[PDB]
Amino acid sequence: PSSTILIPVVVHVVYNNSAQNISDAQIISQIQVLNEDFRRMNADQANTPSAFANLAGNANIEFKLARRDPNGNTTNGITRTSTSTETFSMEMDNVKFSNLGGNNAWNTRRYLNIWVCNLGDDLLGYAQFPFEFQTKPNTDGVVIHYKHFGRDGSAESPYDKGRTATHEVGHWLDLRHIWGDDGGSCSGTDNIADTPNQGGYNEGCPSFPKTDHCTNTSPGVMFMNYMDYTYDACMNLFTKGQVERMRSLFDTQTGIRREMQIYANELTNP
């Protein structure tokens, strides 16, 4: 049993052309996907292998667009900023500052900021981890490539079901890659006991079961976990262990992100 954790969200669309100024419907579809994936309401939970069904987690984390901005003014939770920057840089975090062609974050203690923009080459999106929250508060949040934001619509296959944001919100909530970021070895860890030890990342739509040198017997590795690198339509769960780690950030006494719950209701009611 658990109480619902409520996350006020602001989406910052930063566009260099009309194609990048994505629709309100496309944004609403991304918030819908986050609520499905973090509340185990995703229809494709029907695709989770039965061997992992008893490990699938319901994070009971709800996302709502903000209705009050940091100045106390009414908002629909969507900002739109034209820019002369053609491609934003993860190294510079330039999408996160209006001085650098982007848009400043809204009080990161009270809002999840999701920037949407053009990113380079094979980067679908990126996050800032909770360990950087005290030292880098103004860049906390998530950035998603405009071609991989929302479900269907303007999103491009095979990353067209809004799972880049599920994966990045996972990192923003302290989750690490399921394979342990160790280039294929068995010695790295994601520090989640119920995710099977896994060599390297998976891609595309793997066949179940997929064993590797780290988990050499069926049911193998959880390549359909959101924290892998598989295609959007082929990922369909968080585990109960990942849910425990994410929710710990909202512990009322020690949670790094505990402040977000104090005014979440006030900031998401018009």
Partner: peptide
Amino acid sequence: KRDPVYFIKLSTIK
């Protein structure tokens, strides 16, 4: 998140 299949379209042409 990185797309591991991104450069296929680029590497198979001039």
